[PDB]
């Protein structure tokens, strides 16, 4: 039921009454986005724009044809027009495909969106390519993870997160292509 249409152009009607006219209207983050989700398009064939993001770095903004994301119910591939999906990702390998070549970023979690206008968005917190990872340090930390047993389940909420991140990192490079 839509009797309360909040919005950026509808913020200005109440702002022209209580707030004075001495200030210009404050900006909104929607005014800086050229791409939305509800206006269809952006596919034009077999490609779709993929925006792979960390908080500290924009890793990709090109157009791919296959994106393999490590969802919490397992890996899944995204073709040109996937179903609109909000998929929570576990630690695993985000795999991009523009053609015959593939780049394999290992991510630590964070969600992944597929939008009804065909655009997709991968939103992680730390994404290291596997050439930046060395396996000698990985399961030595799992040897420090799955051995200590604190019954405080705030620490084995972190230790469960430590186990599934390191163990998915071992098979990320031991199952090399």
């Amino acid at each position: 039921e839509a009797a309360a249409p909040a919005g950026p152009k509808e913020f200005t009607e109440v702002w022209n009454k209580k707030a004075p006219s001495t200030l210009i209207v404050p900006e909104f983050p929607s005014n800086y986005t050229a791409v939305k989700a509800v206006g269809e398009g952006q596919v034009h064939g077999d490609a779709f724009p993929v925006n792979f993001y960390t908080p500290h770095s924009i890793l990709s903004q090109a157009q791919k044809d296959t994106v393999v994301l490590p969802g919490v119910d397992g890996y899944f591939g995204v073709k040109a027009s996937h179903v609109p999906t909000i998929a929570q990702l576990k630690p695993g390998v985000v795999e991009l495909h523009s053609g015959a070549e593939s780049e394999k970023f290992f991510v630590s979690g964070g969600f992944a969106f597929v939008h009804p206008n065909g655009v997709t968005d991968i939103c992680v917190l730390e994404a290291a390519t596997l050439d930046q990872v060395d396996p000698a340090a990985v399961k030595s930390a799992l040897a420090a993870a799955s051995a200590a047993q604190p019954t405080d389940e705030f620490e084995q909420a972190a230790n469960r997160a430590a186990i599934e991140l390191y163990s998915a990192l071992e098979s990320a490079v031991e199952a090399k292509a």
Binding site: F11, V14, W15, K18, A19, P20, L23, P26
Partner: protein
């Protein structure tokens, strides 16, 4: 900001704070005012002190 030699930055959004806050609070609702940067803790605790947590 934290150091206050910026010259009109931290005062401008405290004008834009109450121009946005009083626009959206006319229903008798709860409001918590937070500030990031100690130039706001010298500027917002004198204009909105009853709602500064």
């Amino acid at each position: 900001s934290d150091k206050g030699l910026c010259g009109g930055l931290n005062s401008n959004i405290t004008k834009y704070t109450r121009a946005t806050l009083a626009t959206t609070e006319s229903e008798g609702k709860d409001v918590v005012v937070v500030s990031i940067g100690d130039k706001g803790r010298s500027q917002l605790t004198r204009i909105e002190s009853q709602r500064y947590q």
